[PDB]
């Protein structure tokens, strides 16, 4: 019986459909009172500010916020929640010296090590000299840890080796916009591998089959999803770094549940990224990653 209000940016990804299982399951395991309000979309800032204000009205002691933007409540958070202590759940929450006075704990995995984990897999599969390998980058839009954060990460792990980037295509993470990006890729010709979002890769899986190049282009994800997973389970996908979502959720619940019972909790927590391959699918780790089946967001 404790007021904990989780504010997601949406609940469409399997990414958050999982981060959900994490706060949910870690809420009945700590017997707290957690309610979930999803902004319905990233460009739905106005709706989150209100749901954020709705949380307070509901009387939320501490609220776990998954912002639809880092610089959204940078100079205003308190102005929507007051003395309420906020806990960043999955995204960077940049506050001011004044606003910051609210943040008591924050979970979040530096994506740099997700791109790194991905490039490391290919630099180890194509060591310098092994033979020039042309690759295609289909990461995502041009902001939310889908570029420079992951890029530089990927870039580093790939620099001193025989892996060349033919090019890179940006586009929102809509399956259709990415599919289009994949198709263009298949048409180029020199592409050996495609490293992109779980969205991109999922599309590539169907596109490579529909175009009989299933075994001609290797798929490497920059994160995991119920789709990219099934692909690993069927060699349709090669690699994929899992930043354990289900657990990333539990972490946030615990953080606030502890700060509200004065127990010790890690201020700046972040699970450890685990490398996954077609056979390297350790059950214990996929459990703290992707939600169960037959399940349903609650």
């Amino acid at each position: 019986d404790e007021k904990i209000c989780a504010i997601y940016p949406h609940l469409k990804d399997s990414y958050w459909l999982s981060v959900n299982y994490g706060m949910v399951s870690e809420a009945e395991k700590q017997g707290v009172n957690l309610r979930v309000l999803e902004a319905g979309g990233y460009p739905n800032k106005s709706r989150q500010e209100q749901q954020l204000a709705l949380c307070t009205q509901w009387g939320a002691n501490a609220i776990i916020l998954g912002t639809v933007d880092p610089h959204a409540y940078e100079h205003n958070l308190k102005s929507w929640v007051g003395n309420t202590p906020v806990f960043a759940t999955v995204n960077q929450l940049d506050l001011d010296e004044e606003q910051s006075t609210l943040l008591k704990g924050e979970v979040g995995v530096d994506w740099y090590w997700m791109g790194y984990e991905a490039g490391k897999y290919l630099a180890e599969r194509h060591p310098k000299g092994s033979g020039k390998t042309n690759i295609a980058l289909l990461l995502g839009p041009r902001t939310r840890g889908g570029t420079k954060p992951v890029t530089t990460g990927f870039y580093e792990a790939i620099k001193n080796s025989d892996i060349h980037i033919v090019d890179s295509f940006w586009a929102d993470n809509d399956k259709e916009l990415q599919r289009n990006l994949v198709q263009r890729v298949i048409d180029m010709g020199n592409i050996d591998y495609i490293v992109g979002s779980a969205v991109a890769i999922e599309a590539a899986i169907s596109e490579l089959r529909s175009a009989d190049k299933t075994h001609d282009i290797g798929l490497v994800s920059v994160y995991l999803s119920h789709g990219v997973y099934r692909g690993l389970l069927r060699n349709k996908v090669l690699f994929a770094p899992t930043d354990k979502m289900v657990q990333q959720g539990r972490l946030s619940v615990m953080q606030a549940a502890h700060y509200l019972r004065h127990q010790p909790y890690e201020k700046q927590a972040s699970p450890i990224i685990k490398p996954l391959t077609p056979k390297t699918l350790h059950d214990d780790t996929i459990e703290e990653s992707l939600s169960p089946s037959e399940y349903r967001p609650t």
């Binding site: 949406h10 709706r47 119920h226 349903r296």
Partner: protein, 269 residues
């Protein structure tokens, strides 16, 4: 005699009043309306003094009666016109406000049904990925069941939501079109449509995936159903403008009538 001196002014004002009411009819905010009203008030006051004076140049009991009538009808006409502009401004603000609210609601509903669509697909991948592990262990009897659901519920749900999502999208479009609707026929068509479409979604929503979400939506549809007034208010805006037009028409017809009388009074003088 000296009647022709007043009669002219009356004719000069008559043409200014007619100009002033058009100015008033064009008022777009509370100020423009107020200033226009200011000028219309003065001009009309002047018209009344000259008509009064022109009345002394006659003793025909019947004629002056008619005159006084033309005067009265002109006074009421201009006042109703004013009432009309007052309403034009009220209804504009009120429809924009109410439509904005509705947009927000139906927009949320459309996004909600969308999210359900994408969850329902993700869970399909999973429910299948589970058929895999279930198959290897050779529990073929279960794999059978797990397939039946994948069709009876998992697959069948995907269509249900696609339909719900189309209805919500339709609704959202109707509301988006509503804020600038001025065609009486169209307003009624959308109104009938919007109503019937809300009934359909009210029950089609009860049979979704999660019951706790059939509440979120049933609530949004309740908030929207209560907002259906806006269409009647759109018809009220239609009628208000229609009447405004008719009044301005009569304004001209009322003056050529007033002046027609001031002429016969400038003769018998």
């Amino acid at each position: 005699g000296s009647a022709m001196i007043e009669a002219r002014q009356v004719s000069e004002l008559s043409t200014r009043i007619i100009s002033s009411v058009q100015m008033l009819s064009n008022a777009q905010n509370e100020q423009e309306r107020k200033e226009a009203g200011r000028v219309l008030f003065e001009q009309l006051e002047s018209l009344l003094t000259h008509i009064k004076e022109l009345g002394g140049e006659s003793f025909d009991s019947k004629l002056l009666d008619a005159l006084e009538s033309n005067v009265q009808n002109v006074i009421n006409n201009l006042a109703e016109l004013g009432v009309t502009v007052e309403r034009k401004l009220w209804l504009a603000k009120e429809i924009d406000t109410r439509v904005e609210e509705m947009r927000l609601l139906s927009e949320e509903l459309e996004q909600l049904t969308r999210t359900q669509v994408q969850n329902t697909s993700t869970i399909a991948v999973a429910n299948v990925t589970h058929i895999y592990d279930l198959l290897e262990a050779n529990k073929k009897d279960q794999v059978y069941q797990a397939l039946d659901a994948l069709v009876e519920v998992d697959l069948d749900l995907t269509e249900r939501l696609h339909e719900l999502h189309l209805l919500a999208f339709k609704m959202l479009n109707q509301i988006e079109e509503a804020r600038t609707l001025t065609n009486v026929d169209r307003i009624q068509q959308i109104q009938t449509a919007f109503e019937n479409n809300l009934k359909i979604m009210k029950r089609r929503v009860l049979a979704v995936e999660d019951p706790t979400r059939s509440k979120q939506m049933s609530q949004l549809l309740t908030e929207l159903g209560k907002r259906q007034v806006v269409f009647t208010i759109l018809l009220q805006q239609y009628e208000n403008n229609e009447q405004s037009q008719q009044l301005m028409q009569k304004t001209l017809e009322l003056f050529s009538e007033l002046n027609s009388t001031v002429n016969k009074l400038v003769d018998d003088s």
